[PDB]
Amino acid sequence: SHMSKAFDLVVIGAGSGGLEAGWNAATLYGKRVAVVDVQTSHGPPFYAALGGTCVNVGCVPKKLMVTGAQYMDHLRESAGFGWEFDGSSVKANWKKLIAAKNEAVLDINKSYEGMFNDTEGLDFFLGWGSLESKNVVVVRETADPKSAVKERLQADHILLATGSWPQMPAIPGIEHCISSNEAFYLPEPPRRVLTVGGGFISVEFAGIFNAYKPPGGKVTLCYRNNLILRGFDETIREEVTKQLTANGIEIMTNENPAKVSLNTDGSKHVTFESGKTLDVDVVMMAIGRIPRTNDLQLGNVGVKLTPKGGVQVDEFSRTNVPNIYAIGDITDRLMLTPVAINEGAALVDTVFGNKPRKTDHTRVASAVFSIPPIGTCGLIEEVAAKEFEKVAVYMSSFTPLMHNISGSKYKKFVAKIVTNHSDGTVLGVHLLGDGAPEIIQAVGVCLRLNAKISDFYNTIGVHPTSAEELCSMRTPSYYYVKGEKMEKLP
Amino acid sequence: SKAFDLVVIGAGSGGLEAGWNAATLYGKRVAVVDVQTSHGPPFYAALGGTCVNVGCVPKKLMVTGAQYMDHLRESAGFGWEFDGSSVKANWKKLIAAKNEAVLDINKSYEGMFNDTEGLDFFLGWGSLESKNVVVVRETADPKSAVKERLQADHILLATGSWPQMPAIPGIEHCISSNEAFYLPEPPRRVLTVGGGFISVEFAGIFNAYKPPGGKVTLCYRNNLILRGFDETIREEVTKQLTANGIEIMTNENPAKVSLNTDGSKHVTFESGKTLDVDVVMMAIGRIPRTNDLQLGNVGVKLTPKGGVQVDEFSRTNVPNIYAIGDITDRLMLTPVAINEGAALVDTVFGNKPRKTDHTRVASAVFSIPPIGTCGLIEEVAAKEFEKVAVYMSSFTPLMHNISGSKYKKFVAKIVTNHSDGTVLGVHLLGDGAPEIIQAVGVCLRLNAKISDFYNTIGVHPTSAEELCSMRTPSYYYVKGEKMEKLPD
Ligand SMILES: Cc1cc2nc3c(=O)[nH]c(=O)nc-3n(C[C@H](O)[C@H](O)[C@H](O)COP(=O)(O)OP(=O)(O)OC[C@H]3O[C@@H](n4cnc5c(N)ncnc54)[C@H](O)[C@@H]3O)c2cc1C
Ligand SMILES: Cc1cc2nc3c(=O)[nH]c(=O)nc-3n(C[C@H](O)[C@H](O)[C@H](O)COP(=O)(O)OP(=O)(O)OC[C@H]3O[C@@H](n4cnc5c(N)ncnc54)[C@H](O)[C@@H]3O)c2cc1C
Ligand SMILES: O=C([N][C][C]C1=[C][C]=C(F)[C]=[C]1)C1=[C][C]=C([C][N]C(=O)N2[C][C]N([C][C][C]C3=[C][C]=[C][C]=[C]3)([C]C3=[C][C]=C(Cl)C(Cl)=[C]3)[C][C]2)O1
Ligand SMILES: O=C([N][C][C]C1=[C][C]=C(F)[C]=[C]1)C1=[C][C]=C([C][N]C(=O)N2[C][C]N([C][C][C]C3=[C][C]=[C][C]=[C]3)([C]C3=[C][C]=C(Cl)C(Cl)=[C]3)[C][C]2)O1
């Protein structure tokens, strides 16, 4: 009972990547696996738990919460199709939303509890995972390396999968701001909220707050640069800015908070770099996420971190110490659950199966649950324009007929296909509007199969759908030649 | 009379496609005949085809409206609060808004004719007079006033389909989907008759807009609705229509209908069951619209089924006469008809002979909740392949544990030739299914194997990613015979 335990693989982080690897090594290959996490259930104080950032304070609750936010649009848009009810009685109870999310998230926590009790050679250890040596993980009561040892775990192989954490800027009064972590637990919806960042978390939470805000509430999103959502298609960036604007979100571009102080009433006084001021009840920082490397004591074994602070890996998830691997947000690349999952599965097939495999980081389909949402896979046209001599862009944009009736004329569906015009290969596909995230998944499979634009236009539409726009573009709307935009070819 | 390269009888999905490509792509002279310039009684179809006027478009809009019965109830779960007892569904408003949407489309097709060189719209009833002449008359009666005689080097038959009405006493007291679109009042009790997608769709529509104590019944003559769709999906959407308060009578078929003193209809079934309803909507089938064409004047061969016979290039037995869309009784979908029109016109005026592929067409049923499907159901596939595998995923979505629509099970199924892992068919029931399936259509045109699905990186969180997370077959067919494990 006072003895070290010995394992084929120790995984630090029972999240998206770590649980895929752990489960696969144990049930596909009969390896003996230990999995360390700091908490068995979602919430304060450590927020991520068993199941990772995605289950506890990420993809899962944010989706249930955006689902809730969509009803403000449904209730309003119902009028146009003939629905009548007292508009004046309509109230949004945040406490019911939060309590329902809390139950859904705890159920997944509990299902995970049972997986670990039941499955041979897959064990759960509660605490903070640190590297003592090439073959020993120590599990401490806290992230403080001086805290009590609960366990020592011998591992032939060690998987680093501790994920990421919110980045807080060093500004005066930062202690009066929150991250996405605390947002999930606010006991009441803020009347006034600044969400700081042009990234998918700022935009997603702005929509949530915008819908659950009490009477006379206001949601402000601020971003240091000119146009939110860097990395996504410029048409889609511009349009989702109009659509957030049209739903009563104030977008402050080229603005950045310099300091936060309390007003005498407990509210927050934000001073921007520009000298502008805003009073809010909540300042949610969402300016980025950083690899959680601190607490691992990587120094003890000399695991190399990148310039940026991520664990350096090759294509096979291998650090500079052989037998020590890193996957998911700790590698500080694409910060997505299914990428974490694919990397973990590829790592286990390589180390423990004998089917070596490297995750493909290109043509990865992803979504933004803005209202309305983004669906995207592959290159945006300006990235394409720098790698291929001739890029074609197929664009279709329209107001869905249903929104001529709903009264939401402002909800432009946008569908964009980017091709290598030399040979028709689809490089990239971008969608804005309802069902964009469900449309784009299958588009992922197409691109992995090197679909050309003719493979798309030769497929017969399903009518009536938004999706059918993708099988209806025969003529490029414009081109890039040698990196330069033009309606026509010379 | 006037001179044309192409006369198109019918200005619908396939006819307008064919007409538009002939004029704007090949510089041909084109006459198109339809019987009405905009939607609704007396002829229901018009400029646009059945889809635009009394089919895909209005029905989608009206299903969109019916969905708000689920949205309003399901919002409680996410903490939305309002006086439920003040909730009322105004059908008149829905119809008026549908009507405006359809009229603006009819007007934009007028627009297109006025502005398109070599493309002419003629109002009236087309029929063949001889091999090279289309007559347009005042009405369907082949002895009404000639309006136009059109000399044509090529003639395209594109008159579409009509609701099949069975030969039973009191069939006059029944409506079709055409009249459903124009009901002045939402029926309190209604009987949709038929297991196909039109009966199911309308059942959903009426269920939402029904006045206070109303009731939607759907009856089908055989034991399970929606023949031709995956059997699991067929069983599940049955469960889910019942759950939302729609009575499904299986193995029941109307024997007659009579008038009640209050203007309601008394339906007697073959079993001798009886049901009093405000409306009986017949949706047992659709048949090629071939009567008014006078096909005998030239001897265009019909199939036993009633549809105009064509080869794979939509050519009839008469040299310069072609048929596309519903009139050929192949797949009765708009994009299939558009794809035949385009294909015919390239063949005849483009010397690039193209045939339309009728395999692995994606289709949708706009049930609540909706179906999305492409390619073979496992039963058809078991008759064509030694080793078929079926991968199955079925769950209540987390959002329906919260809304309280616990009954809304999502179903994803992939059918494969297990010999090589080739994806034969994909079948979805759940929110987004019709959106999910479109690109699956592109996938089946790229010889996607099951492993191509499960090696694609998921988009999380979605229903769609369930397609890319199935690696172990649930069960198999070996020489036609369902079994859980392989014999080895
Ligand atoms: C608000 C938000 C929304 C998101 N939405 C989406 C989305 O919709 N779709 C999507 O694809 N991605 C989304 N993401 C990103 C997604 O959550 C991550 O990419 C994914 O969770 C990363 O998985 P991972 O395996 O790298 O680590 P994680 O899932 O983060 O798991 C790491 C685990 O390690 C634990 N841990 C850390 N240090 C230690 C230690 N020393 N010892 C023990 N345990 C430790 C943590 O408690 C955590 O449980 C979202 C992220 C956030 C913050
Ligand atoms: C209620 C309903 C819902 C449907 N929903 C969908 C759906 O969601 N998706 C889908 O893909 N398909 C759907 N369909 C099927 C779709 O409507 C048809 O497959 C499609 O419209 C067929 O086009 P077509 O060119 O064959 O004929 P049509 O589109 O019907 O065009 C035929 C035209 O010919 C005209 N005409 C007829 N006789 C004459 C004559 N003698 N002279 C001149 N003109 C004449 C008619 O007025 C009509 O406008 C639906 C059908 C119905 C009935
Ligand atoms: O809503 C929605 N969605 C979603 C789904 C749905 C639905 C419907 C409903 F109820 C619900 C839902 C929406 C809106 C709008 C949309 C679309 N867009 C448009 O419109 N487009 C334009 C262009 N195209 C092309 C094709 C070809 C052709 C040609 C000619 C002939 C015919 C055809 C058309 C056109 C063109 C040309 C001309 Cl001239 C014409 Cl007139 C037309 C396509 C595309 O969508
Ligand atoms: O709803 C819905 N949907 C839709 C979308 C969404 C969502 C969520 C939310 F809130 C909203 C919306 C539903 C429910 C149920 C179902 C199904 N089933 C299951 O199970 N799955 C899960 C999983 N996957 C992938 C992978 C997984 C795994 C891994 C490893 C090992 C184990 C497992 C995804 C996910 C999910 C969930 C979770 Cl929690 C996770 Cl973490 C993940 C598949 C699927 O779905």
Side-chain angles (χ1 to χ4, degrees):
Chain A
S1 77
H2 296 108
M3 236 63 74
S4 143
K5 289 142 260 280
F7 294 101
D8 287 310
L9 173 78
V10 177
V11 178
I12 311 186
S16 290
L19 290 180
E20 177 72 359
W23 172 260
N24 279 16
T27 63
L28 294 180
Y29 301 123
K31 292 324 205 188
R32 337 232 290 186
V33 185
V35 180
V36 197
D37 217 296
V38 304
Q39 226 172 255
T40 50
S41 103
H42 72 91
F46 298 137
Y47 283 113
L50 200 39
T53 298
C54 187
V55 162
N56 291 280
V57 284
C59 343
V60 166
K62 86 88 175 305
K63 185 61 229 302
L64 300 181
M65 279 168 81
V66 166
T67 303
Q70 271 157 358
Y71 288 110
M72 180 181 73
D73 285 19
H74 288 322
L75 291 225
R76 165 170 49 85
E77 285 167 7
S78 74
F81 294 89
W83 293 85
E84 312 173 346
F85 52 96
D86 179 17
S88 89
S89 62
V90 163
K91 103 128 304 228
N93 183 334
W94 180 257
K95 301 186 185 47
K96 279 213 248 291
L97 176 62
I98 286 307
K101 172 273 301 197
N102 283 357
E103 212 205 334
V105 172
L106 183 59
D107 282 313
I108 301 156
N109 295 330
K110 281 179 165 164
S111 58
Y112 278 133
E113 234 167 23
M115 168 186 76
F116 279 112
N117 300 333
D118 285 343
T119 309
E120 287 317 301
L122 181 69
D123 303 71
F124 180 71
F125 295 100
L126 178 57
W128 292 84
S130 6
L131 258 38
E132 202 181 72
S133 83
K134 187 189 199 281
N135 298 97
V136 178
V137 180
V138 183
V139 187
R140 281 190 206 273
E141 285 186 0
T142 86
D144 189 349
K146 296 194 160 188
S147 57
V149 170
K150 318 179 63 184
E151 300 290 354
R152 279 192 162 71
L153 302 189
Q154 321 185 214
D156 283 4
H157 306 261
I158 303 163
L159 179 52
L160 308 193
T162 49
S164 42
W165 202 243
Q167 194 190 12
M168 303 302 268
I171 62 171
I174 194 53
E175 74 278 2
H176 304 116
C177 306
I178 59 154
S179 71
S180 64
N181 282 336
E182 287 77 21
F184 287 109
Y185 295 89
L186 298 174
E188 59 188 33
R191 171 165 154 258
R192 298 153 305 177
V193 40
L194 182 65
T195 68
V196 184
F200 71 97
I201 296 161
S202 187
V203 166
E204 285 175 358
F205 264 94
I208 293 165
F209 290 138
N210 181 55
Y212 280 83
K213 63 192 198 289
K218 186 57 157 185
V219 169
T220 307
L221 180 147
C222 71
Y223 174 58
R224 60 180 319 101
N225 302 123
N226 170 248
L227 177 64
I228 57 159
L229 289 165
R230 198 224 314 131
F232 298 86
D233 162 283
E234 208 180 281
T235 312
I236 292 179
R237 291 172 68 186
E238 280 177 280
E239 261 304 330
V240 64
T241 300
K242 293 170 203 196
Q243 292 190 15
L244 291 182
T245 292
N247 213 25
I249 301 169
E250 176 99 336
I251 306 284
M252 286 168 57
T253 53
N254 309 281
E255 296 295 341
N256 198 48
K259 97 187 113 171
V260 180
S261 52
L262 294 194
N263 292 315
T264 65
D265 70 12
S267 79
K268 279 84 196 209
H269 196 78
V270 177
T271 306
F272 295 89
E273 286 180 10
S274 59
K276 299 154 68 97
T277 70
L278 178 65
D279 300 292
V280 304
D281 312 284
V282 169
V283 177
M284 200 198 70
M285 288 289 175
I287 65 162
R289 286 180 68 77
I290 52 177
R292 274 174 100 171
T293 46
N294 287 305
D295 307 322
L296 281 187
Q297 306 303 282
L298 293 176
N300 292 358
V301 282
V303 171
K304 215 192 161 196
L305 305 172
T306 61
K308 284 187 87 272
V311 172
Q312 188 158 265
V313 289
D314 68 348
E315 290 174 310
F316 296 90
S317 289
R318 301 182 298 204
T319 68
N320 59 302
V321 187
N323 102 114
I324 296 187
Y325 321 98
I327 63 176
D329 297 2
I330 201 184
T331 63
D332 197 5
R333 231 248 254 216
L334 288 175
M335 287 220 189
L336 298 176
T337 278
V339 176
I341 282 170
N342 189 270
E343 285 184 314
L347 161 69
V348 166
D349 290 335
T350 305
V351 169
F352 290 127
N354 252 337
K355 207 167 200 300
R357 212 185 89 230
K358 47 202 217 159
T359 288
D360 185 1
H361 296 277
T362 68
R363 313 176 280 181
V364 179
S366 62
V368 174
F369 290 92
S370 60
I371 331 193
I374 298 182
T376 184
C377 190
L379 301 177
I380 69 174
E381 63 201 52
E382 58 262 61
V383 164
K386 288 226 284 294
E387 306 178 17
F388 303 93
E389 195 164 279
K390 292 178 170 150
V391 168
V393 178
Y394 306 85
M395 180 163 56
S396 171
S397 198
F398 47 84
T399 313
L401 249 62
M402 76 161 282
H403 288 308
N404 289 317
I405 298 169
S406 91
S408 301
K409 250 125 200 159
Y410 65 86
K411 299 189 167 186
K412 297 260 157 288
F413 199 83
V414 172
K416 265 176 78 181
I417 307 173
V418 181
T419 61
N420 176 356
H421 190 68
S422 290
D423 68 352
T425 311
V426 185
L427 297 179
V429 172
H430 320 278
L431 305 182
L432 174 51
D434 301 304
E438 311 282 348
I439 296 154
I440 205 64
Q441 173 78 82
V443 157
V445 180
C446 293
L447 262 51
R448 262 201 73 255
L449 289 172
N450 293 302
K452 310 204 153 81
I453 184 71
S454 64
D455 294 313
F456 274 94
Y457 61 66
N458 282 339
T459 300
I460 306 222
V462 189
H463 182 64
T465 62
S466 302
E468 70 179 346
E469 293 308 311
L470 297 179
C471 306
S472 272
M473 284 159 308
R474 209 218 301 129
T475 285
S477 309
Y478 54 93
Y479 302 76
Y480 289 90
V481 186
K482 303 177 202 296
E484 171 195 14
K485 176 138 91 79
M486 43 183 82
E487 187 203 6
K488 277 284 131 47
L489 265 23
Chain B
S1 73
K2 343 248 201 265
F4 296 94
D5 295 298
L6 181 60
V7 185
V8 173
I9 309 169
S13 314
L16 287 167
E17 186 62 6
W20 165 274
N21 292 4
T24 74
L25 294 194
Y26 296 102
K28 288 327 195 187
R29 222 188 267 173
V30 185
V32 182
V33 190
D34 222 294
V35 300
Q36 216 171 267
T37 49
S38 50
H39 68 102
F43 301 131
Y44 298 101
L47 207 42
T50 310
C51 185
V52 153
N53 292 284
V54 294
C56 342
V57 158
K59 90 83 179 304
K60 190 49 196 292
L61 288 181
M62 294 171 62
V63 172
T64 296
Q67 273 157 6
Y68 288 112
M69 167 177 64
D70 293 31
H71 291 323
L72 294 172
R73 173 176 48 85
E74 289 173 347
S75 69
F78 305 82
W80 291 88
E81 287 165 2
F82 57 82
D83 187 16
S85 77
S86 54
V87 163
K88 195 239 169 216
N90 188 338
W91 171 267
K92 267 140 155 49
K93 256 249 253 178
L94 175 65
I95 299 300
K98 172 267 287 179
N99 286 355
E100 184 197 19
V102 170
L103 193 62
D104 291 3
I105 302 174
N106 296 142
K107 279 171 166 157
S108 103
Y109 278 122
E110 257 184 54
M112 168 213 71
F113 273 110
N114 299 162
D115 295 343
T116 303
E117 189 180 330
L119 191 62
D120 273 58
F121 178 74
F122 292 96
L123 180 62
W125 300 74
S127 35
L128 280 11
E129 184 161 280
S130 60
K131 191 177 157 184
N132 311 122
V133 184
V134 175
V135 206
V136 176
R137 294 177 175 275
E138 220 92 66
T139 75
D141 196 338
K143 277 140 277 136
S144 51
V146 178
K147 312 191 54 202
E148 307 285 331
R149 268 194 173 72
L150 310 185
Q151 284 177 153
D153 285 354
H154 309 265
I155 306 171
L156 174 52
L157 308 178
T159 52
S161 51
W162 203 244
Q164 188 175 358
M165 298 295 287
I168 67 163
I171 197 56
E172 60 277 18
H173 292 286
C174 297
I175 67 168
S176 68
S177 56
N178 296 331
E179 295 85 9
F181 283 112
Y182 297 90
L183 291 169
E185 310 284 17
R188 188 166 171 285
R189 304 151 307 166
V190 44
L191 182 57
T192 72
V193 179
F197 70 93
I198 303 167
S199 181
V200 174
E201 283 173 358
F202 266 98
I205 286 153
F206 294 128
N207 190 41
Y209 282 95
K210 74 188 184 290
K215 172 59 143 174
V216 182
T217 309
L218 178 155
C219 68
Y220 178 47
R221 68 178 319 127
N222 307 113
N223 92 292
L224 189 69
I225 65 176
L226 289 165
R227 296 266 157 214
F229 292 89
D230 174 85
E231 181 173 322
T232 317
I233 284 182
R234 286 159 78 191
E235 286 159 343
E236 257 306 315
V237 35
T238 298
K239 229 215 174 82
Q240 296 191 30
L241 298 175
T242 305
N244 204 15
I246 298 169
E247 182 74 60
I248 293 86
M249 300 180 80
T250 47
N251 306 282
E252 301 289 359
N253 199 40
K256 61 169 189 247
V257 189
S258 49
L259 216 218
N260 294 151
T261 59
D262 70 14
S264 63
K265 278 47 151 183
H266 178 89
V267 187
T268 319
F269 302 91
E270 292 183 11
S271 72
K273 287 188 184 74
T274 63
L275 210 75
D276 291 302
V277 295
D278 294 296
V279 165
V280 187
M281 197 201 67
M282 281 285 145
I284 52 155
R286 294 186 48 84
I287 61 173
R289 211 159 167 205
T290 68
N291 292 316
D292 314 339
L293 284 165
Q294 293 308 282
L295 292 193
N297 275 339
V298 289
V300 187
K301 259 227 198 91
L302 298 171
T303 60
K305 295 257 281 134
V308 168
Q309 197 145 283
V310 292
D311 69 15
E312 303 201 332
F313 291 90
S314 305
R315 286 197 295 260
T316 69
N317 75 133
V318 178
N320 56 310
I321 304 196
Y322 324 101
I324 60 172
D326 287 9
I327 207 184
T328 57
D329 200 0
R330 265 105 110 249
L331 292 195
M332 295 202 186
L333 304 165
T334 271
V336 174
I338 293 169
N339 188 274
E340 290 168 356
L344 165 73
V345 154
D346 290 335
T347 304
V348 163
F349 302 119
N351 67 282
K352 40 173 186 242
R354 197 165 44 75
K355 65 186 155 228
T356 289
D357 176 5
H358 305 266
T359 71
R360 309 158 299 162
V361 173
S363 47
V365 181
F366 280 96
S367 48
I368 299 144
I371 294 164
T373 176
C374 187
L376 301 186
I377 59 181
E378 52 205 69
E379 29 256 273
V380 171
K383 271 220 164 62
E384 289 181 353
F385 292 103
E386 189 183 325
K387 287 166 55 161
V388 182
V390 183
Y391 308 66
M392 193 174 141
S393 170
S394 197
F395 62 82
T396 300
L398 249 47
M399 76 161 289
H400 292 312
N401 288 334
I402 289 175
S403 78
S405 310
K406 282 168 208 304
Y407 64 82
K408 283 190 180 174
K409 308 231 226 286
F410 194 95
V411 186
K413 284 178 78 177
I414 316 176
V415 174
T416 76
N417 182 350
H418 183 59
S419 311
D420 69 4
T422 299
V423 184
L424 294 177
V426 184
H427 319 285
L428 314 168
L429 164 84
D431 290 327
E435 289 293 355
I436 297 165
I437 201 68
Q438 175 58 95
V440 175
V442 180
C443 280
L444 266 47
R445 293 206 74 255
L446 291 158
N447 299 32
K449 298 180 145 73
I450 174 94
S451 57
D452 299 308
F453 276 84
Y454 67 66
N455 291 320
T456 302
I457 293 199
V459 185
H460 189 63
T462 65
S463 302
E465 80 184 305
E466 224 59 44
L467 286 185
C468 298
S469 270
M470 284 177 286
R471 28 169 52 78
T472 299
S474 311
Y475 62 77
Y476 309 86
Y477 299 71
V478 170
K479 250 291 151 275
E481 179 222 344
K482 183 161 163 295
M483 67 184 67
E484 168 174 294
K485 296 154 151 77
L486 287 186
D488 66 50

